[PDB]
Scaffold this active site. Sequence first.
Site, PDB file in Angstrom:
ATOM      1  CD  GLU A 357      -2.882  -0.969  -0.124  1.00  0.00           C
ATOM      2  OE1 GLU A 357      -3.111   0.167  -0.588  1.00  0.00           O
ATOM      3  OE2 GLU A 357      -3.326  -2.017  -0.639  1.00  0.00           O
ATOM      4  CG  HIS A 487     -13.540  -7.264 -10.449  1.00  0.00           C
ATOM      5  ND1 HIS A 487     -13.529  -8.333  -9.579  1.00  0.00           N
ATOM      6  CD2 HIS A 487     -12.538  -6.446 -10.051  1.00  0.00           C
ATOM      7  CE1 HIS A 487     -12.558  -8.172  -8.699  1.00  0.00           C
ATOM      8  NE2 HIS A 487     -11.941  -7.035  -8.963  1.00  0.00           N
TER       9      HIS A 487
HETATM   10 ZN    ZN Z   1      -2.969  -2.366  -4.097  1.00  0.00          ZN
END
Ligand code: ZN
Lengths: 596, 195
Positions: A357, A487
């Site tokens: 991240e 998705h």
């Molecule tokens: Zn990511």
Amino acid sequence: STIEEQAKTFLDKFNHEAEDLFYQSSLASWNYNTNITEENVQNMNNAGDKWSAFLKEQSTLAQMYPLQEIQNLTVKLQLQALQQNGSSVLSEDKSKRLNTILNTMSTIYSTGKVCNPDNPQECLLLEPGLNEIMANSLDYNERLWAWESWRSEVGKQLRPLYEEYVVLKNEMARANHYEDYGDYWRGDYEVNGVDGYDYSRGQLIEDVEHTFEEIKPLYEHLHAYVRAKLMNAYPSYISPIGCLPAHLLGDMWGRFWTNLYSLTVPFGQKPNIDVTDAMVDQAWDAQRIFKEAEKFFVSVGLPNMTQGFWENSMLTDPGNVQKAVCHPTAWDLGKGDFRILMCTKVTMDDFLTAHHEMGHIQYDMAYAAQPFLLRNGANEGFHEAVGEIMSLSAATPKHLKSIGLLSPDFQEDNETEINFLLKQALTIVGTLPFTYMLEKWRWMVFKGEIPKDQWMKKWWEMKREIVGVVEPVPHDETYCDPASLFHVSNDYSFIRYYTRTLYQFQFQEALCQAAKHEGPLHKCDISNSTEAGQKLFNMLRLGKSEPWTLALENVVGAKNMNVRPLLNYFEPLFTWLKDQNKNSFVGWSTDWSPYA
Amino acid sequence: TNLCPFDEVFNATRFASVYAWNRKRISNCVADYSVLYNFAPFFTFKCYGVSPTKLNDLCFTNVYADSFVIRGNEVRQIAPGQTGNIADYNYKLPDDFTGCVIAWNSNKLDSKVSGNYNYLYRLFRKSNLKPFERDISTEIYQAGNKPCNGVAGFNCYFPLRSYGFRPTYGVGHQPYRVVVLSFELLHAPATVCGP
Ligand SMILES: [Zn+2]
Ligand SMILES: *[C@@H]1O[C@H](CO[C@@H]2O[C@@H](C)[C@@H](O)[C@@H](O)[C@@H]2O)[C@@H](O[C@@H]2O[C@H](CO)[C@@H](O[C@@H]3O[C@H](CO)[C@@H](O)[C@H](O)[C@@H]3O)[C@H](O)[C@H]2NC(C)=O)[C@H](O)[C@H]1NC(C)=O
Ligand SMILES: *[C@@H]1O[C@H](CO)[C@@H](O[C@@H]2O[C@H](CO)[C@@H](O[C@@H]3O[C@H](CO)[C@@H](O)[C@H](O)[C@@H]3O)[C@H](O)[C@H]2NC(C)=O)[C@H](O)[C@H]1NC(C)=O
Ligand SMILES: *[C@@H]1O[C@H](CO)[C@@H](O[C@@H]2O[C@H](CO)[C@@H](O)[C@H](O)[C@H]2NC(C)=O)[C@H](O)[C@H]1NC(C)=O
Ligand SMILES: *[C@@H]1O[C@H](CO)[C@@H](O)[C@H](O)[C@H]1NC(C)=O
Ligand SMILES: *[C@@H]1O[C@H](CO)[C@@H](O)[C@H](O)[C@H]1NC(C)=O
Ligand SMILES: *[C@@H]1O[C@H](CO)[C@@H](O)[C@H](O)[C@H]1NC(C)=O
């Protein structure tokens, strides 16, 4: 006063107004995702609505400058991105029809529940209920139940909506002068007017298909080895030559084969590297994890986290009364405010995710100087690829030893590396045929190459043929099995996970080459290599300003997506798989199904 | 004889917007230049043609304290020969600028959670600024070839944009109170001395 000058001045106004309004929306979204209140809900919607209304207003405003009259490609990129954002391509009715469909499909997915057949009182949601079954259950029938019930109850609801979703999404794309909605999604990779770096939307299919051909030999041996291991655990359920049953693949769709590691680990005697205990032994906390992650990027010459990062990020779960959305996300709120939201535990997995991240943050800070419309990854696969390679290096035994999480008296034999690569291939390699075939089916559905009455016929024809995965229960056209995935039913392009996977190993191989790393690619740590960080930064600072082909070349010296680094990363496993499949059938037969 | 009113300029409750930068004429007083430090988070003190080391050994005809607020990035534009929105459209220092630029982070004062929109800057102008020029006009900037009619619209933008300072902004976007000491030299008795 020309019209490019008008657009230049217009973008100057938009950049300053958007950054302010985007920041309010991002901070309101942040305050909701760390402090879940009905107020913080409302303020998020209000800021989100004011941001969308601004974007709709600016999209229409941007369209009054025709594109053929701007020579500056940087201005045209921002202008095109703002105009392509233009919602007023469909009639307000059909736009309203599409938004209602998208919300309903999103709601059916997130609220879709199935109940136990024996006792219809107890009902399970997909997350965590059905996902818990798909990731942990070893029982065939329970896995067959959760897989089928999710597709039979929730998927069948999405079938009429997805049919109308395709029609309107195509109509939208056809009005934006794209062939179809699949062509619209492939526009993320399109590059024009940059000689030597141009890339057409149609070329994406060719590059995906050309690179998937070189993935096939690795996948078939991975598929054959997984089938052989699963066949030992399910002798009466798996044919030695047939496709893998769709419900026995580790999750609700077989998107990742990660949870097959327990049944498919090459050497279950040799223990996996898990520094979670060492972190607890050394009294590590979430602050230490991100400080170590920050130390990793400093070692490659990237800047430390901003002072606002440590102050304003959420690195621990607030616990107690204050609830939060604990999905690990890296936040670029704009105006120098970079944060990470993460309910970090003292575990190896969260340790790697913090590097992952923060890798997004490093990407965000690097292109923060770019114009607002160009503050993004070079394409949809770049940002995720940048985050992935951080966890690649952070998880290596060399990195874990250098930071005192793996003691020196640990030595790595080739069996634990094959164990590690097999686990990586289950997640990384196993998703590629799933990702390509799913997006290929969606591409063909948008193109009109699959009629409505053959959607699930072709979806499972391609599942068996391409992914080597067979449905455990025959599905008519009342089903919509792609929409049973997030998705597909939440209107997200899916080829990004294929391109990112090839990008990340292209990135990692290049950075390791810059790091002067000797040995197998999977063992590489880019730590303490400022040359690797500089080569990465020369792309990170680009953002969307340059073509993704050029941003790719600024790291790997190649203008196009290449699968060779992916195969280079997995070659020790690939040779091991071919040796292990000596007396095993490699490939699969599509005619075999567990329902005979 | 009397102390120069630097506390008025530096410790002003609210600084001027950079487009409407405040100018305070300093004259006929003793200038204590070692008082210029507010224990601020990011202090900046760069002089030009004059020496900040022992700045209190010189008489000057007049001292022009120019005060305004910009964000952290734009402080670099408060310097001779610089380019950018602030230098071009808000506050231009001459190439031969004789004086000092004092800047410091004011996120504690000039930032609000809801966003401090008090501080504006000029985003558009038909031309750049002459050194020490000040344009406080709110006339709608004409980007297109059609009229603006005094109201904002398509190709007609209000020339002033607000910073919207918030305390969680990055250092490059946090508010920075900037004082520009412009030292004037003339054929006059030079009535700003003081150790
Ligand atoms: Zn990511
Ligand atoms: C028009 O633009 C909006 C806004 O997108 C934002 O502004 C652009 C100018 C770019 O700078 C973008 O990078 C930026 O995000 C688009 O809406 C956005 O759509 C995407 C995907 O559809 C959303 O991504 C996800 O959103 C969920 C929401 O819960 C997040 O949880 C995920 O983490 C992920 O970010 C994105 O959030 C959304 N933007 C906002 C503000 O919600 C829109 O798609 C676009 N339309 C067209 C036709 O181009
Ligand atoms: C604006 O107000 C601030 C108060 O918020 C004034 O702060 C003062 O700053 C000066 C810096 O020149 C300080 O003097 C220095 O003190 C240290 C010890 O703290 C000493 O070692 C140095 O030799 C020097 O004398 C001063 O202590 C500080 N506080 C007060 C109450 O004066 C600032 O002076 C004001 N600005 C102007 C232009 O008046
Ligand atoms: C395309 O336009 C950009 C600006 O929109 C040009 O780059 C700017 O050039 C000016 C001229 O000095 C600088 O003040 C800016 O800092 C530059 N960057 C930006 C982001 O504004 C660029 O040169 C133009 N390119 C072409 C080929 O016309
Ligand atoms: C969460 O929001 C409430 C208002 O809805 C507020 O009173 C509370 O202080 C917030 N909590 C935190 C930790 O900011
Ligand atoms: C880290 O941040 C500090 C700011 O206090 C800065 O001085 C330093 O250069 C940054 N980077 C490193 C590697 O120390
Ligand atoms: C590891 O290497 C040894 C020889 O050093 C060999 O006997 C063994 O088969 C190898 N194992 C794997 C999984 O490659």
